[PDB]
Design a protein around this ligand. Structure first.
Ligand SMILES: COC(=O)c1cc(O)c2cc(NC(=O)NCCCNC(=N)NC[C@H]3O[C@@H](n4cnc5c(N)ncnc54)[C@H](O)[C@@H]3O)ccc2c1
Ligand SMILES: COC(=O)c1cc(O)c2cc(NC(=O)NCCCNC(=N)NC[C@H]3O[C@@H](n4cnc5c(N)ncnc54)[C@H](O)[C@@H]3O)ccc2c1
Lengths: 320, 335
């Protein structure tokens, strides 16, 4: 609340050009389906996505926002001359009273690793309560991807200590083992921007989330995930796995893949305890599950099961 | 709590990342290498205490400068890595890594010199200075050498171009996305400037609105500097603005000066925005909102660096300032 009552989080979101342009186009390209229709904007923030919906031809937009920024959104709507058809309503979408069920829901709800501190549950609540049967969901689905990685930045950080002798005339190569323990031997999910160079095998879709589904909400508690299998491109040190997501609008995709333009979500990196050598065509299989943490269900936990080539299957249990 | 804070600092400095950042700070690490090796005449055949030796690199520089013995005292678990580094370089007969706080370590004799990289953000946020002064009183010989010997504090008024971009962001949305959000400028200003937090951020020379002013100096050898720290380190300043600009506040930074070399041109490690960047950046003190100023507008005031009442190591800065003929104002900041 203090967070989304403050400008910084909203500036960061809008300044994510990939994100904001993708939502903009995802809405404006659905003009045929929004023309003369009503929309609920779940967690409307500053109101910018609600105004795109108006530009796409919506006859009415209900912009519901729980934090104090709703005051700024009301100002923005007025300043843009849309108070006749964009209505900012304060408070949680779970208690808000709309005058009618709506033809469409728009929302930007995704967190790091898709589900860390996300507002998905509020979007599903609004879907059940306020979306007419078969209504438009913008976006309508989320797809989760995994790929094994060789992280170039990690390699640079591990190899830093062997370059001190050249910078300052003091040998510190012995610190590589320690650096590896510190940077890989923890059980934290690391949020970091990867490059396409870092991807060691074809990315694998391992789960899908269909936001229209009644029951998705209770499904999340047991975990979202599934198996994967891939074959490595070439020789490299395997450092672990990257997890990322995309969301799909009814007909456009907003991707957070390392192979696509960077976004503020970056990727979620799952490091093994130490590098593992892989060669071309090394087979890697496993399972990834996104789970709520025991102490706080907003906090993301990822359980990783993996098998590299012939080696024994191993597991690592990560938390944000 | 103080126990929780001590544990967090221990875990931080037992981990690689903070040491990677410090050694990768070439401005910092080169300045200490040069300031030490420049003092070879004073260190040849002498004993050195390195307060908070980390991975040991500065203790090794002292050995390379000709010291006969270096005691490298390090409180966090990184002392084990320092031991390995010293052994790797063939120096463990001269450089002795000793675990624990310098306040309770035992050395076989008072030493000829102390070396330490103790500085925090805004100089005194979470710094090791109290530990260096403790070591000086307890282990430094009379007339011994302190490297660096002093710290100096500087201030300059700023028009922060990054801040202006953040404040103007909302007026720019319409050109990119077709939605007018100009009405959020006031909100953005209250959020970004109306707080009382010290902001640590890199500034550029272009952000500097008047000649920087030195407002305090700390001479590490002064037995009595400890009392000055609780009462507040600071001083007064006056500058004249270069040109028209929105005044956003003040930037505070430091330098440390090493003994030896040219008596009139000592070696200095600076964190000024006018000089190459360091990991310490600068400490920015924003006014509640921008103040228009003109060429030759006078700005004067007083800046005091203080301990936070509930954490002596959390930096508090008291700013008293007067812009032109405006009434004098005050703002109290904390890290
Ligand atoms: C009385 O209760 C409160 O005021 C409240 C309580 C919470 O637990 C919140 C927890 C929060 N955390 C997240 O949203 N984390 C997800 C990460 C991505 N976030 C995102 N892009 N959000 C966009 C906007 O959505 C609003 N928003 C969130 N939840 C609801 C809801 N149920 N009804 C209406 N608006 C809602 C937020 O205020 C943002 O402007 C945020 C706000 C919250 C507000
Ligand atoms: C058992 O350890 C604890 O309980 C503990 C408690 C603290 O309050 C600490 C508080 C800490 N905060 C700072 O270090 N702040 C200074 C600002 C920048 N950091 C820096 N340049 N430090 C260099 C190294 O110095 C070591 N170091 C710090 N204090 C002492 C001391 N009294 N004796 C010997 N070594 C010491 C550190 O472990 C670092 O490697 C760190 C560690 C700390 C450790």
């Amino acid at each position: 609340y203090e967070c989304y009552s403050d400008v910084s989080v909203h500036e960061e979101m809008i300044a994510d050009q990939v994100r904001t342009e993708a939502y903009r186009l995802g809405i404006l390209k659905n003009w045929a389906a929004l023309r003369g229709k009503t929309v609920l904007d779940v967690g409307a923030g500053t109101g910018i996505l609600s105004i795109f919906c108006a530009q796409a031809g919506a006859r009415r937009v209900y912009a519901v926002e729980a934090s104090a920024i709703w005051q700024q959104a009301r100002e923005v709507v007025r300043l843009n001359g849309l108070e006749d058809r964009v209505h900012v309503l304060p408070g949680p979408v779970e208690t808000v009273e709309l005058p009618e069920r709506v033809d469409a829901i728009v929302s930007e709800w995704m967190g790091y690793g898709l589900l860390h501190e996300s507002m998905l549950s509020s979007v599903l609540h609004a879907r059940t309560k306020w979306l007419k049967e078969g209504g438009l969901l913008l976006p309508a689905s989320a797809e989760l991807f995994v790929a094994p990685i060789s992280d170039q930045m990690l390699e640079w950080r591990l190899g830093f200590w062997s370059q001190v002798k050249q910078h300052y005339g003091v040998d510190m190569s012995c610190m590589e083992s320690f650096a590896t323990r510190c940077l890989m031997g923890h059980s934290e999910i690391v949020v970091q921007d990867l490059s396409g160079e870092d991807v060691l095998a074809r990315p694998q879709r391992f789960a899908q989330l269909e936001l229209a589904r009644a029951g998705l909400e209770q499904e999340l508690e047991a975990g979202v995930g599934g198996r994967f299998r891939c074959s490595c491109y070439g020789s490299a040190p395997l450092h672990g796995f990257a997890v990322w997501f995309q969301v799909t609008f009814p007909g456009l995709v907003l991707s957070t893949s390392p192979l696509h333009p960077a976004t503020h979500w970056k990727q979620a990196l799952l490091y093994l305890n130490e590098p593992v050598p892989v060669e071309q065509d090394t087979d890697i299989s496993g399972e990834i599950t996104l789970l709520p943490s025991p102490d706080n269900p907003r906090r993301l936990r990822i359980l990783l099961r993996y098998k590299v080539g012939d080696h024994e299957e191993k597991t690592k249990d990560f938390a944000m």
